[PDB]
Amino acid sequence: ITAYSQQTRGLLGCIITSLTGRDKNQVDGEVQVLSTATQSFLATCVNGVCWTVYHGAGSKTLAGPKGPITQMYTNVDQDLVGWPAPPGARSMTPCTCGSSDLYLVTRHADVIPVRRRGDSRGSLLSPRPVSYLKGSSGGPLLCPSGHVVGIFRAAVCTRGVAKAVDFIPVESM
């Protein structure tokens, strides 16, 4: 698995788009880099829904070509929200080959190995600074074949080093 990223907006434009709800940029790729005023996170497109963490998006709309997109799925207890994916996003497919060495795609488009530990827990195969994972919530956890098994929720860390991640299973989507 490889990844590369492409910024599409700067600061002024993010701000105004948030107030208008109206996104006329052409959308593409599997994973959207999102921002509000408060934070920046990711959304994984899986079966034509853009998914992301509830602790990031809250219950807010997603700016779209025609104006704000209402959440179609809002689960506060699973920390999961979903918007109808904007046209152009590349939709991933949920894994089922059931592999257990997994791949976390970050905001910096690195692709870090994660050992599946349980339904929605993983251990990093080599420690990263947690700072490096900041902004990656919502990102995809991939199996070797490129399918999605979930989206990053939370890093478990001590003294600044992320050892394990918590994730929301694709199952729950």
Binding site: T17, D23, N25, L34, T36
Partner: peptide
């Protein structure tokens, strides 16, 4: 206001 897409990640 809205959540805004400010970039993307392409998967290979």
């Amino acid at each position: 206001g809205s959540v805004v897409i400010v970039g993307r990640i392409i998967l290979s």
